[PDB]
Amino acid sequence: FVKTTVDNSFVGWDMQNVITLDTSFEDAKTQVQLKKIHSSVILLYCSKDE
Amino acid sequence: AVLILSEARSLGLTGYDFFWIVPSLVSGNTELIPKEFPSGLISVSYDDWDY
């Protein structure tokens, strides 16, 4: 839904990255994958504990 | 230097188009190259083996 809304409106949205960090993300995946996002707005989507 | 290069490779600054240059004291003995040194370290040093 986000990708459809972004690529269809008129304002002009520059969506930088889409990250899907799976597994228990103990220390490896989280740290190696979260270091690229250095934009100004982050749109989280997860359960409470995650 | 080893720590900084290892932390910078994670950030994504060590691709085909990133050139690192370091003085002699970073590579001051040779033949003991660590694991984290990339290929293309343009480093000046005292005469390697001709002297």
Task: Note the resolution in Å, 1 decimal.
Answer: 3.7
Q: Which of A27, A29, A34, A35 to mutate to test the interface with B (most CBs of B within 10 A)?
A: A35
Decide if A36 touches B, using CB distance below 8 A.
Answer: yes
Q: How was this structure determined?
A: cryo-EM
A17 neighbourhood in chain B, CB within 8 Å: none
Q: How far apart are CA A48 and CA B42, in angstroms?
A: 49
* φ, ψ for residue B10, nearest 5 deg: -65, -40
- Cα atoms in the 13 Å half-sphere on the side-chain side of B46: 4
Tokens of A42: 């982050």
- Structural tokens at position A4: 């459809």
Using left for φ > 0, alpha for ψ between -120 and 50, and beta otherwise, residue B30 falls in left
State chain B's maximal CA–CA distance in angstroms. 39
B11 touches chain A (CB under 8 A): yes
